[PDB]
Design a protein around this ligand. Sequence first.
Ligand SMILES: CC[C@H]1CCCCN1C(=O)CSCC#N
Lengths: 237, 300
Amino acid sequence: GAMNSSNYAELFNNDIKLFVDDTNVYRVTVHKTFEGNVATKAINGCIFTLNPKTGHLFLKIIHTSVWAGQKRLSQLAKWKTAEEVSALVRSLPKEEQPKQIIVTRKAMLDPLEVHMLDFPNIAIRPTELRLPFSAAMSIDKLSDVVMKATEPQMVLFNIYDDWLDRISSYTAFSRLTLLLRALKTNEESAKMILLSDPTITIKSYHLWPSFTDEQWITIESQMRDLILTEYGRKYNV
Amino acid sequence: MNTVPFTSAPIEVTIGIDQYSFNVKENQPFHGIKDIPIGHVHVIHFQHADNSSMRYGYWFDCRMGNFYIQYDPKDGLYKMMEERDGAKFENIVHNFKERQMMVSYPKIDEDDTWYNLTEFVQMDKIRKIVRKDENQFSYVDSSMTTVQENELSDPAHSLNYTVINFKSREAIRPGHEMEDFLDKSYYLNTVMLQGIFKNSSNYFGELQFAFLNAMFFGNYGSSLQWHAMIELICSSATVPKHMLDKLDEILYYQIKTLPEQYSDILLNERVWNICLYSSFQKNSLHNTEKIMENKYPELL
Ligand SMILES: CC[C@H]1CCCCN1C(=O)CSCC#N
């Protein structure tokens, strides 16, 4: 069934599963034509396919050429996403294929279900959680590789850097979702918190800074404050 | 004109013949139904006055033999049987006509309703959906399940309708995933019409039989099958113009004959709002759209 606060720990059990988010697949700037009409111009996007237990991120870059001469692109994007996720699964060894795929938006269910008909035993599930994965393009190295791509490309990351050497998957996912929720609600302030102290760096092979355990507690607290604030600023509380 | 007679009516029952029905009291002197139009299938159906659980009945074609009904006190139902002796049957039948113990199949001559509801329904196709080959006629009741229902339990008693499944390998060509899911023309035209049904007449015969079983017996699986067959056409961009015209007439007479008080249950909102207003054929069902709007604007 659907994934929610009640069955939340199921994410970190030993059944392989992937989250699929499609909110950055079809990206456009909306601008004016010389005639004063409005036109869109696409930019590169990406599918965000994430193993929440291991941190492994399959970032499929969606190059603007895929949209050339196509109609109803918002609908196409969902089917393109499902085609690429199906292709990913087929590329994995059998023992690496997921038993469940959880889509972050319910409109991906039928597209993915239809592309996965060859995999009757892989459950396609929605979720009632409002996950902040749209903010993945606020992570500088992920945004840089998408915008620079000149062709379709799959890039692999561990979205948890080396955190699993010191914390559990549950704690790592909570940290990730807090960071992403902050970047989503006020990207500029979130980035200021992360990169303020000149002494803490991002390793070349990592996405986030090299915080000690104590610094991570301070960072996490500062991110909570930002989120509550904006919730006040937004709601006037 | 042909006759489906009865040995007697030992229990109070409402007896239907096609779209007609009459009440018969316990041990009332009822010996059957005469003047039944030759040329069409028919259905004779029953609802006991004391246990409205189980509507049941029999599809038959008077051309395929002489068929009568006797109440079985052990199994508790009116059973159809096929006599193999002529003369005695006609002589008792003459006598039955002579004592005027029979109701007349009461067809208004202006009225084409039954033809229009059974236009493509043939006993041969009924007998393949309802498997019981030692009888020329076919029993159906409210509770029988379909093959597809059983997949998701007694096979001998199943309705073997053609399985339609829009998220299935049969329906979706590898590499045309989006194309085939949003435009079912290849499932309709190549898979089902050319491949399984062979022609649109056999497609329409099954659609019509499914509707009739849903209406007369409350058969839930038949209602699902009726709507699935409609949806496959309404969700295809490419349908022969003659099928679209005929489908409009088919559905018109089904919606016309449906009791007004049964619309809540036998009609599926999603299928009809898609077929009439959102689908490829939203503009090709003028007569069906007109009666649904004047008779069931609530559902829409
Ligand atoms: C259906 C009316 C006739 C002819 C068909 C076979 C059985 N019939 C009966 O009436 C059953 S008691 C009279 C005797 N025998």
